[PDB]
């Protein structure tokens, strides 16, 4: 068995979804975070010397000496390996698509802040539009716990979960008008393995 | 055989890479573009009524009545189906990763303009850093025409191609200092099927 | 000794307001534009070596021998020099406050494009919201035309420039904003401006 | 009748410069901050219904009964009212031009974060480039301290606020910029400011 190491900053950012997947699947790894105690940047600067990275960016997932970079690609990789990307060519596609939708609004969020005075337009206009998109998708199956794709958990379920979870750390629990989404995020929040990672966090 | 239709605006944007893939593979489709003649927005508004889209956004790829959205997901889908995503679990991963790198700098580019006065920092600092990243990757195999992954064309080769091609429409042919990349983009530019699509464009 | 030279790229961008000002007033200057010839960025490279710019940006306006930089700062300087910035402390602040907001929606506009897929939210949300603000402000002002007081101020041209700019890329409603509509058309008809605009 | 009330969120953001100004001058006002209590955005929702704001943004500063909006416009108004905006036409433009640039690097800072993965380019490219500009400008000015002329202007505080802001999130070099370093520390020591800063 190869040693599994995850390199990133001492934050969620683009790394939390990978951490959730390892938790969901319960696979063990070292969660190496830069700047727990010292200067995150110096560590990162030296890391990029010591480690051979494609794009001088983290997350970096290391199995053995195999070096894997790009969080989305890591998630897709982790998901085939561990059977959470759906059971058909169509359903693999849908999961990918809804994950693509996630990283879009998830980016909009990491682009909203006080200084930019776009916090209300995010809250008032961006989010609800996207919450509605996911809501209408959970309605598409409607075919009972809550899955985006097929009748089994996929990484799109975690990604959606993580999106709203991360938003809920900046801004108010805003999912009243989206009952299916609200149910979906809680259902998955209370899966034993994820629920124990969360409270450990 | 299902009818294949691509919906998008009368531009390259996020749709050009899909158009290149259909060209590379020579598979036939209707290239439906909004606003060739009329108001692109009205068309798009009505399109979103007539068609059931996940995220009220195009590209939309329609096979039969199957509705597929999200350009990156469409490309990954098209690539498994047609054997241009590499011949191993590792190599599928690398292609994904380098495509992830592409949509990052490709986004930076679509975020640079005159008004923002960030055209020189893009040209002077962003691009060369990224050109170097791809350069150093083409050096990793070095294992002869030019491929990013393994010894066969993958969609990462087209994506890189399309990135620089699109940049070369806004800004100057800036690839002198990156001979492998320069070779790679031309090699692929002169593949019969792509070269004929280009000149037809 | 003026003279007067405006350096920018061969485009509108951040220099257009200054051109519209020089138009309105009838100030003659050389409108030097990068890349009327070839690599705009090569001129620009050399310009940065020859002229001494504070932040390495353009527009920069040279009046005889002083290098003036930063477009909003330049337009504030020109508006005080030629009396188009309001006739009281209060009003002048107002003209300033409106220009500040113009910069914001103007930024947002040059931040929407096809690729970002944010065009329709701009057209259905950002633009209409800001057209809403400009409308009320105009209602707040017209008694018995102008944003501030009784005369042309640069807020009137800033706002005109903005909507003019947006109309080169997008359909754009203005019919739900009748007071905004008549404001911009008023400014478009002013002979110095109509002239300039017909000569672009 | 002042009085004087500053409404913002419970943070620095775009109101800090105005606080530093009120500090420097020793103006007393109520620093009303959203969410000292609960949902900041609920106060903000209600504030927008009660007060009449031009663009639905904050900060807004009420002096007796006039609602002043837009922070850069507000700071320009305050700086002319209390003589910290330069003692000639030229210098005042200069103070303006420097503030305009401060807004740009300041924007860029609040545009860098972990997720965007643009922190290191900011730290290795944007910041050092702009620290470079501020340095030369300071060299251009000191003869025998200040950005413009002979006295404190708001450009000095804007620049101080900027680097102060950046130092809450990032290491930040200033040692390669000795004239910039001594400039900000000078301003930090000024008793009105040192006091204020020690009371945050
Ligand atoms: Mg990624
Ligand atoms: Mg996509
Ligand atoms: Mg400016
Ligand atoms: Mg402002």
PDB file of N, CA and C in Angstrom, chain D residues 34-100:
ATOM      1  N   UNK D  34     -22.933  47.415  11.077  1.00  0.00           N
ATOM      2  CA  UNK D  34     -23.921  46.370  10.910  1.00  0.00           C
ATOM      3  C   UNK D  34     -23.435  45.050  11.485  1.00  0.00           C
ATOM      4  N   UNK D  35     -24.343  44.350  12.157  1.00  0.00           N
ATOM      5  CA  UNK D  35     -24.048  43.048  12.738  1.00  0.00           C
ATOM      6  C   UNK D  35     -23.150  43.061  13.967  1.00  0.00           C
ATOM      7  N   UNK D  36     -23.111  44.161  14.722  1.00  0.00           N
ATOM      8  CA  UNK D  36     -22.518  44.096  16.065  1.00  0.00           C
ATOM      9  C   UNK D  36     -23.454  43.199  16.893  1.00  0.00           C
ATOM     10  N   UNK D  37     -24.642  42.961  16.325  1.00  0.00           N
ATOM     11  CA  UNK D  37     -25.759  42.267  16.979  1.00  0.00           C
ATOM     12  C   UNK D  37     -26.101  40.852  16.428  1.00  0.00           C
ATOM     13  N   UNK D  38     -26.518  40.784  15.169  1.00  0.00           N
ATOM     14  CA  UNK D  38     -26.960  39.520  14.580  1.00  0.00           C
ATOM     15  C   UNK D  38     -26.759  39.586  13.088  1.00  0.00           C
ATOM     16  N   UNK D  39     -27.789  39.226  12.326  1.00  0.00           N
ATOM     17  CA  UNK D  39     -27.664  39.204  10.868  1.00  0.00           C
ATOM     18  C   UNK D  39     -27.379  40.623  10.351  1.00  0.00           C
ATOM     19  N   UNK D  40     -26.105  40.843  10.014  1.00  0.00           N
ATOM     20  CA  UNK D  40     -25.623  42.089   9.438  1.00  0.00           C
ATOM     21  C   UNK D  40     -26.437  42.473   8.206  1.00  0.00           C
ATOM     22  N   UNK D  41     -26.816  41.467   7.431  1.00  0.00           N
ATOM     23  CA  UNK D  41     -27.560  41.679   6.204  1.00  0.00           C
ATOM     24  C   UNK D  41     -29.033  41.980   6.455  1.00  0.00           C
ATOM     25  N   UNK D  42     -29.505  41.775   7.686  1.00  0.00           N
ATOM     26  CA  UNK D  42     -30.890  42.112   8.039  1.00  0.00           C
ATOM     27  C   UNK D  42     -30.980  43.586   8.420  1.00  0.00           C
ATOM     28  N   UNK D  43     -30.065  44.047   9.273  1.00  0.00           N
ATOM     29  CA  UNK D  43     -29.848  45.480   9.473  1.00  0.00           C
ATOM     30  C   UNK D  43     -29.733  46.186   8.130  1.00  0.00           C
ATOM     31  N   UNK D  44     -28.832  45.674   7.297  1.00  0.00           N
ATOM     32  CA  UNK D  44     -28.572  46.252   6.005  1.00  0.00           C
ATOM     33  C   UNK D  44     -29.836  46.298   5.150  1.00  0.00           C
ATOM     34  N   UNK D  45     -30.630  45.231   5.162  1.00  0.00           N
ATOM     35  CA  UNK D  45     -31.913  45.231   4.446  1.00  0.00           C
ATOM     36  C   UNK D  45     -32.793  46.391   4.897  1.00  0.00           C
ATOM     37  N   UNK D  46     -32.854  46.586   6.217  1.00  0.00           N
ATOM     38  CA  UNK D  46     -33.732  47.584   6.842  1.00  0.00           C
ATOM     39  C   UNK D  46     -33.205  49.003   6.690  1.00  0.00           C
ATOM     40  N   UNK D  47     -31.897  49.164   6.904  1.00  0.00           N
ATOM     41  CA  UNK D  47     -31.199  50.412   6.613  1.00  0.00           C
ATOM     42  C   UNK D  47     -31.512  50.961   5.204  1.00  0.00           C
ATOM     43  N   UNK D  48     -31.509  50.088   4.197  1.00  0.00           N
ATOM     44  CA  UNK D  48     -31.843  50.455   2.814  1.00  0.00           C
ATOM     45  C   UNK D  48     -33.296  50.941   2.641  1.00  0.00           C
ATOM     46  N   UNK D  49     -34.191  50.463   3.503  1.00  0.00           N
ATOM     47  CA  UNK D  49     -35.582  50.895   3.510  1.00  0.00           C
ATOM     48  C   UNK D  49     -35.777  52.209   4.277  1.00  0.00           C
ATOM     49  N   UNK D  50     -35.011  52.388   5.353  1.00  0.00           N
ATOM     50  CA  UNK D  50     -35.162  53.565   6.204  1.00  0.00           C
ATOM     51  C   UNK D  50     -34.436  54.782   5.635  1.00  0.00           C
ATOM     52  N   UNK D  51     -33.110  54.711   5.559  1.00  0.00           N
ATOM     53  CA  UNK D  51     -32.343  55.738   4.845  1.00  0.00           C
ATOM     54  C   UNK D  51     -32.581  55.598   3.353  1.00  0.00           C
ATOM     55  N   UNK D  52     -32.479  56.714   2.640  1.00  0.00           N
ATOM     56  CA  UNK D  52     -32.564  56.734   1.187  1.00  0.00           C
ATOM     57  C   UNK D  52     -31.155  56.823   0.558  1.00  0.00           C
ATOM     58  N   UNK D  53     -30.600  55.686   0.143  1.00  0.00           N
ATOM     59  CA  UNK D  53     -29.275  55.676  -0.480  1.00  0.00           C
ATOM     60  C   UNK D  53     -29.323  55.700  -2.014  1.00  0.00           C
ATOM     61  N   UNK D  54     -28.369  56.415  -2.638  1.00  0.00           N
ATOM     62  CA  UNK D  54     -28.384  56.601  -4.100  1.00  0.00           C
ATOM     63  C   UNK D  54     -28.197  55.287  -4.874  1.00  0.00           C
ATOM     64  N   UNK D  55     -27.278  54.452  -4.393  1.00  0.00           N
ATOM     65  CA  UNK D  55     -26.899  53.266  -5.149  1.00  0.00           C
ATOM     66  C   UNK D  55     -27.089  52.004  -4.373  1.00  0.00           C
ATOM     67  N   UNK D  56     -27.745  52.122  -3.218  1.00  0.00           N
ATOM     68  CA  UNK D  56     -27.946  51.001  -2.309  1.00  0.00           C
ATOM     69  C   UNK D  56     -26.646  50.402  -1.761  1.00  0.00           C
ATOM     70  N   UNK D  57     -25.643  51.239  -1.545  1.00  0.00           N
ATOM     71  CA  UNK D  57     -24.368  50.746  -1.025  1.00  0.00           C
ATOM     72  C   UNK D  57     -23.979  51.464   0.240  1.00  0.00           C
ATOM     73  N   UNK D  58     -23.023  50.883   0.953  1.00  0.00           N
ATOM     74  CA  UNK D  58     -22.397  51.544   2.081  1.00  0.00           C
ATOM     75  C   UNK D  58     -20.891  51.500   1.856  1.00  0.00           C
ATOM     76  N   UNK D  59     -20.121  52.365   2.538  1.00  0.00           N
ATOM     77  CA  UNK D  59     -20.503  53.358   3.522  1.00  0.00           C
ATOM     78  C   UNK D  59     -21.393  54.472   2.999  1.00  0.00           C
ATOM     79  N   UNK D  60     -22.262  54.945   3.885  1.00  0.00           N
ATOM     80  CA  UNK D  60     -22.883  56.253   3.727  1.00  0.00           C
ATOM     81  C   UNK D  60     -22.697  57.029   5.021  1.00  0.00           C
ATOM     82  N   UNK D  61     -22.443  58.323   4.875  1.00  0.00           N
ATOM     83  CA  UNK D  61     -22.123  59.224   5.970  1.00  0.00           C
ATOM     84  C   UNK D  61     -23.222  60.274   6.004  1.00  0.00           C
ATOM     85  N   UNK D  62     -23.887  60.379   7.148  1.00  0.00           N
ATOM     86  CA  UNK D  62     -24.913  61.389   7.345  1.00  0.00           C
ATOM     87  C   UNK D  62     -24.348  62.500   8.216  1.00  0.00           C
ATOM     88  N   UNK D  63     -24.296  63.706   7.651  1.00  0.00           N
ATOM     89  CA  UNK D  63     -23.898  64.915   8.388  1.00  0.00           C
ATOM     90  C   UNK D  63     -25.176  65.724   8.646  1.00  0.00           C
ATOM     91  N   UNK D  64     -25.653  65.640   9.893  1.00  0.00           N
ATOM     92  CA  UNK D  64     -26.949  66.210  10.253  1.00  0.00           C
ATOM     93  C   UNK D  64     -28.029  65.508   9.458  1.00  0.00           C
ATOM     94  N   UNK D  65     -28.400  66.059   8.301  1.00  0.00           N
ATOM     95  CA  UNK D  65     -29.446  65.412   7.486  1.00  0.00           C
ATOM     96  C   UNK D  65     -29.148  65.070   6.038  1.00  0.00           C
ATOM     97  N   UNK D  66     -27.947  65.380   5.572  1.00  0.00           N
ATOM     98  CA  UNK D  66     -27.613  64.986   4.221  1.00  0.00           C
ATOM     99  C   UNK D  66     -26.926  63.627   4.210  1.00  0.00           C
ATOM    100  N   UNK D  67     -27.459  62.753   3.367  1.00  0.00           N
ATOM    101  CA  UNK D  67     -26.892  61.446   3.116  1.00  0.00           C
ATOM    102  C   UNK D  67     -25.776  61.600   2.082  1.00  0.00           C
ATOM    103  N   UNK D  68     -24.531  61.386   2.513  1.00  0.00           N
ATOM    104  CA  UNK D  68     -23.380  61.318   1.587  1.00  0.00           C
ATOM    105  C   UNK D  68     -23.025  59.852   1.288  1.00  0.00           C
ATOM    106  N   UNK D  69     -22.971  59.494   0.007  1.00  0.00           N
ATOM    107  CA  UNK D  69     -22.571  58.143  -0.410  1.00  0.00           C
ATOM    108  C   UNK D  69     -21.248  58.080  -1.182  1.00  0.00           C
ATOM    109  N   UNK D  70     -20.788  56.854  -1.436  1.00  0.00           N
ATOM    110  CA  UNK D  70     -19.527  56.562  -2.153  1.00  0.00           C
ATOM    111  C   UNK D  70     -18.254  56.965  -1.389  1.00  0.00           C
ATOM    112  N   UNK D  71     -17.549  55.965  -0.863  1.00  0.00           N
ATOM    113  CA  UNK D  71     -16.377  56.252  -0.051  1.00  0.00           C
ATOM    114  C   UNK D  71     -15.335  57.141  -0.703  1.00  0.00           C
ATOM    115  N   UNK D  72     -14.941  56.937  -1.964  1.00  0.00           N
ATOM    116  CA  UNK D  72     -13.862  57.824  -2.480  1.00  0.00           C
ATOM    117  C   UNK D  72     -14.362  59.247  -2.597  1.00  0.00           C
ATOM    118  N   UNK D  73     -15.645  59.395  -2.930  1.00  0.00           N
ATOM    119  CA  UNK D  73     -16.257  60.703  -3.033  1.00  0.00           C
ATOM    120  C   UNK D  73     -16.327  61.315  -1.647  1.00  0.00           C
ATOM    121  N   UNK D  74     -16.777  60.529  -0.665  1.00  0.00           N
ATOM    122  CA  UNK D  74     -16.782  60.985   0.737  1.00  0.00           C
ATOM    123  C   UNK D  74     -15.372  61.421   1.185  1.00  0.00           C
ATOM    124  N   UNK D  75     -14.353  60.590   0.980  1.00  0.00           N
ATOM    125  CA  UNK D  75     -13.032  61.020   1.408  1.00  0.00           C
ATOM    126  C   UNK D  75     -12.517  62.261   0.667  1.00  0.00           C
ATOM    127  N   UNK D  76     -12.939  62.457  -0.580  1.00  0.00           N
ATOM    128  CA  UNK D  76     -12.534  63.666  -1.303  1.00  0.00           C
ATOM    129  C   UNK D  76     -13.229  64.898  -0.713  1.00  0.00           C
ATOM    130  N   UNK D  77     -14.506  64.749  -0.380  1.00  0.00           N
ATOM    131  CA  UNK D  77     -15.240  65.795   0.305  1.00  0.00           C
ATOM    132  C   UNK D  77     -14.607  66.113   1.656  1.00  0.00           C
ATOM    133  N   UNK D  78     -14.301  65.110   2.459  1.00  0.00           N
ATOM    134  CA  UNK D  78     -13.746  65.403   3.776  1.00  0.00           C
ATOM    135  C   UNK D  78     -12.368  66.072   3.706  1.00  0.00           C
ATOM    136  N   UNK D  79     -11.556  65.648   2.735  1.00  0.00           N
ATOM    137  CA  UNK D  79     -10.200  66.166   2.576  1.00  0.00           C
ATOM    138  C   UNK D  79     -10.144  67.616   2.133  1.00  0.00           C
ATOM    139  N   UNK D  80     -11.135  68.048   1.342  1.00  0.00           N
ATOM    140  CA  UNK D  80     -11.238  69.474   0.957  1.00  0.00           C
ATOM    141  C   UNK D  80     -11.813  70.349   2.088  1.00  0.00           C
ATOM    142  N   UNK D  81     -12.689  69.770   2.903  1.00  0.00           N
ATOM    143  CA  UNK D  81     -13.340  70.472   3.998  1.00  0.00           C
ATOM    144  C   UNK D  81     -12.360  70.745   5.128  1.00  0.00           C
ATOM    145  N   UNK D  82     -11.404  69.832   5.294  1.00  0.00           N
ATOM    146  CA  UNK D  82     -10.414  69.922   6.366  1.00  0.00           C
ATOM    147  C   UNK D  82      -8.970  69.995   5.877  1.00  0.00           C
ATOM    148  N   UNK D  83      -8.791  70.524   4.668  1.00  0.00           N
ATOM    149  CA  UNK D  83      -7.467  70.952   4.205  1.00  0.00           C
ATOM    150  C   UNK D  83      -6.376  69.891   4.144  1.00  0.00           C
ATOM    151  N   UNK D  84      -6.730  68.647   3.853  1.00  0.00           N
ATOM    152  CA  UNK D  84      -5.718  67.592   3.759  1.00  0.00           C
ATOM    153  C   UNK D  84      -5.691  67.035   2.346  1.00  0.00           C
ATOM    154  N   UNK D  85      -5.872  67.916   1.368  1.00  0.00           N
ATOM    155  CA  UNK D  85      -5.895  67.491  -0.017  1.00  0.00           C
ATOM    156  C   UNK D  85      -4.944  68.300  -0.915  1.00  0.00           C
ATOM    157  N   UNK D  86      -3.921  68.889  -0.315  1.00  0.00           N
ATOM    158  CA  UNK D  86      -2.900  69.566  -1.095  1.00  0.00           C
ATOM    159  C   UNK D  86      -3.100  71.060  -1.156  1.00  0.00           C
ATOM    160  N   UNK D  87      -2.002  71.789  -1.298  1.00  0.00           N
ATOM    161  CA  UNK D  87      -2.078  73.242  -1.233  1.00  0.00           C
ATOM    162  C   UNK D  87      -1.908  73.981  -2.581  1.00  0.00           C
ATOM    163  N   UNK D  88      -1.918  73.244  -3.684  1.00  0.00           N
ATOM    164  CA  UNK D  88      -2.019  73.868  -5.000  1.00  0.00           C
ATOM    165  C   UNK D  88      -2.892  73.001  -5.883  1.00  0.00           C
ATOM    166  N   UNK D  89      -3.316  73.532  -7.028  1.00  0.00           N
ATOM    167  CA  UNK D  89      -4.071  72.753  -8.021  1.00  0.00           C
ATOM    168  C   UNK D  89      -3.305  71.485  -8.385  1.00  0.00           C
ATOM    169  N   UNK D  90      -2.040  71.668  -8.756  1.00  0.00           N
ATOM    170  CA  UNK D  90      -1.157  70.580  -9.129  1.00  0.00           C
ATOM    171  C   UNK D  90      -1.092  69.473  -8.090  1.00  0.00           C
ATOM    172  N   UNK D  91      -0.716  69.834  -6.868  1.00  0.00           N
ATOM    173  CA  UNK D  91      -0.598  68.877  -5.780  1.00  0.00           C
ATOM    174  C   UNK D  91      -1.877  68.113  -5.441  1.00  0.00           C
ATOM    175  N   UNK D  92      -2.980  68.842  -5.367  1.00  0.00           N
ATOM    176  CA  UNK D  92      -4.292  68.253  -5.214  1.00  0.00           C
ATOM    177  C   UNK D  92      -4.629  67.198  -6.286  1.00  0.00           C
ATOM    178  N   UNK D  93      -4.270  67.475  -7.536  1.00  0.00           N
ATOM    179  CA  UNK D  93      -4.408  66.492  -8.596  1.00  0.00           C
ATOM    180  C   UNK D  93      -3.546  65.301  -8.265  1.00  0.00           C
ATOM    181  N   UNK D  94      -2.294  65.564  -7.897  1.00  0.00           N
ATOM    182  CA  UNK D  94      -1.375  64.517  -7.478  1.00  0.00           C
ATOM    183  C   UNK D  94      -1.958  63.638  -6.376  1.00  0.00           C
ATOM    184  N   UNK D  95      -2.417  64.236  -5.277  1.00  0.00           N
ATOM    185  CA  UNK D  95      -3.060  63.466  -4.178  1.00  0.00           C
ATOM    186  C   UNK D  95      -4.204  62.602  -4.706  1.00  0.00           C
ATOM    187  N   UNK D  96      -4.939  63.165  -5.668  1.00  0.00           N
ATOM    188  CA  UNK D  96      -6.047  62.475  -6.335  1.00  0.00           C
ATOM    189  C   UNK D  96      -5.511  61.289  -7.157  1.00  0.00           C
ATOM    190  N   UNK D  97      -4.577  61.578  -8.049  1.00  0.00           N
ATOM    191  CA  UNK D  97      -3.926  60.544  -8.846  1.00  0.00           C
ATOM    192  C   UNK D  97      -3.378  59.378  -7.998  1.00  0.00           C
ATOM    193  N   UNK D  98      -2.684  59.675  -6.885  1.00  0.00           N
ATOM    194  CA  UNK D  98      -2.216  58.600  -5.971  1.00  0.00           C
ATOM    195  C   UNK D  98      -3.346  57.807  -5.320  1.00  0.00           C
ATOM    196  N   UNK D  99      -4.394  58.482  -4.866  1.00  0.00           N
ATOM    197  CA  UNK D  99      -5.548  57.751  -4.356  1.00  0.00           C
ATOM    198  C   UNK D  99      -6.184  56.834  -5.419  1.00  0.00           C
ATOM    199  N   UNK D 100      -6.194  57.290  -6.665  1.00  0.00           N
ATOM    200  CA  UNK D 100      -6.764  56.495  -7.749  1.00  0.00           C
ATOM    201  C   UNK D 100      -6.021  55.190  -7.925  1.00  0.00           C
TER     202      UNK D 100
END
